[model samples]
Target: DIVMTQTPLSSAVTLGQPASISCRSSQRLVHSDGNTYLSWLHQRPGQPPRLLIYKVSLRFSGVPDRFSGSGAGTDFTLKISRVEAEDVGIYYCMQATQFPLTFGGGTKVEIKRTVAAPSVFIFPPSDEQLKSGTASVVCLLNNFYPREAKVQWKVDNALQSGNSQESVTEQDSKDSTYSLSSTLTLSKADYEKHKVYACEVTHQGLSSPVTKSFNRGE
Candidate 1:
């Protein structure tokens, strides 16, 4: 299956300002019919996706003129001439040129005022796990807006790799914010030798990375 990736996964826009999203496909989205099978959709909160553009640049029925699509082959773009409050939602680029349809990682649109920073928390390894010779630590990020964040794990001031699993970001129904979790595993000997284990989060709303740490024996 062809994969689609979108840039600027989350966007903050002011009213009446322009916003743009770029979508790249692993394979060219052109069909034998000589048309690019790329399409764009907007998905508002609690609503199904609404088609805005099809066949690269053709506007779907009832779609506003403010929305436009362009590009060919493997690169595509979706542009909003003037953003409105009603445009606060997630935008997706999809491809139907292949046997199996595929959609890009959606781009989230939010009013600047609605952006929020994630609250970070780190859970230490349990005594039971310590006794079993392996330690597992979990990091939780809660109530962030725009739905894009970068999480990294570090041990004793050095970045750690390969032993961590991160969850997909999930929206909170009540607040419309997003949350996700990551777990890092280490051997009991390594856990005990490390003085500090930290989860660092980088989000657009924050000027600096937010970190939560767990000290051994704490």
Candidate 2:
């Protein structure tokens, strides 16, 4: 489905300041199946973003009760009741009710200090670490609620090369917990040499901190 992606005018936002974002659909969302699918998300630092609000207004379970969503028919709005130090991150509005699922241009969040948190998590097996050939890494973020969260790769505590992080959803046993996954294809060279590396998650927070040193080879 053709959707519109709208972001804030300012590319650079102060880490501590709060901001807003908006998105519109090309059509009224009158699907033949009779359903309007719109959702909101925020990417926390160092992790992938989870489903915040779905169908435009349904706040996923386990989400901070403070994070509320509202809108109907097409015009929608997702506002954070109170922005917290951990809340500093990008926000996104997505429509899964339609095909070729899409999300708005995420907002870039800035934090005031160095308090960092995990935005995404990586689960193995999807990347085939068990196989003998090149083993890729599948990263995941659980119950995430920000948009500005981006993933990075590191070897021996040092930043190694990598691919552009992308978003993919998965099922979580915990209710209200949404999982975001990404895959990285590392050749035999790096995987063989660097046994104790990490996939770092980063974003805005009171303290823009990082979670590192995840041993891929287990």
Candidate 3:
């Protein structure tokens, strides 16, 4: 894959406060067999960027074609035809055809005037929390935007926080509907077992964070 960069000219962050970046690739992507192993990436302020696009046209396993990448023979581009609130982060591109499949610098969908778009419901609690309860899993939601969501947990009408995790927003396909889920793992300090935790999701005030829980899994 080739690398690409997104740099803001005068600090026009669609997500706000100079949140833009550029992408650049290493080595040419034109292969002897006629292939371009170029991809795109995104890195937030506190998170590492991930490969959003691969093989020039194939969206990364979980990414959508909307976050597309094009160009070849040393030049490539990663484009998000329409910007979404959740797409407000840095972007990058890279090449993975030879040794050292390097990554491009990156780009961010600066926050300029993002609309509070509609979002679907996402369940967070899908696994069990047990003794030494430490839980962390990454549930994903695709085909949605706005990036305006939250994660809450409820154990029999109570809140939980010791062993649960969720991922930051990422881009999805052109479709408008979203399929979001949360990850709940076991943490190493809780003195509970067979307990239930729910993930509450609220986007555009559609509904409450749907609640689902799990017990120990063998």
Candidate 4:
């Protein structure tokens, strides 16, 4: 009545590179509508798991066209044309054709080891945005390698649990390198607190993570 699913342990890849996560169901997942009931999803840190593909091959709204889903009854695959920084996360496959819903174990995508260290900077909101009681902190990371970086925020050393919107990795032709950015919006009260805000970056080979800080007081 049921079968197991599987995915790779990890993926160490470069920026603008192609990657794939595969799934296999134990039984046929075809539904009455003649479409498979399997779907694909991504889970990121401090964020809710989101659906990327549905009905076997249809991509979710707002998801880039580069993401695709394909497969027959029991064999399925999810692929990204080019890997992006935001794509560094866990991927899963789910099924609902049967009585109970089921899911795959999931696969994690990790940054490949590289000599190119990430350069990080935090851009705070301007006066007008801050005055309106709504502001944002934009974090930039560039010249990184293996296209993998661990990005996070800390308010006065306490980890921020909110998720950030991120950009895809952009390939630089001249240097064969890459870059991407992320943004975290904040409340007016949090900004006014003048608490230390830090952007942390973790790469493949670094023994320690690189950090950048900002505070209105400083």
Give the candidate number with the greatest lDDT.
Answer: 1
The better-scoring model by TM-score among 1 and 2 is: 1
Q: Go through the candidates in order and give the clash count of each.
A: 0, 27, 46, 0
Query: What lDDT does the true structure give each of the candidates?
Result: 0.86, 0.59, 0.53, 0.78
The estimated TM-scores of all candidates read 0.54, 0.45, 0.42, 0.54
lDDT of 4 by residue, 15-129 (tens): 7888988888877888888767888988875578999999888999999988999899678999989887677778888888886788888888765434787778888788889
How close is each model in CA RMSD to the real structure?
Answer: 7.3, 10.6, 10.4, 9.0
Model 3 ranges off by over 4 Å: 1-27, 114-218
- Candidate 2 lDDT over residue span 98-205, tens digit each: 688877777654433333344555554344444656666676655543335667766666665555356744212222123455676666665667656566765554
Q: How does residue 53 of candidate 3 score in lDDT?
A: 75
Ranking by TM-score: 4, 1, 2, 3
Error of 1 at 82 (Å): 0.7
The CA root-mean-square deviation of candidate 2, after full C-alpha superposition on the true structure, stands at 10.6
Residue 18 error for model 1, in Å? 0.4
**Per-residue error at 117 for model 4, in Å?**
6.7
- lDDT per residue (tens digit) for residues 1-218 in model 1: 99999988988776789999999988777788887888999887667999999999999989999999999878899999998767878899989889788988899887644789988999999898899999999999888877778999999989888999988554543455778899998899988887989999999889999999978886
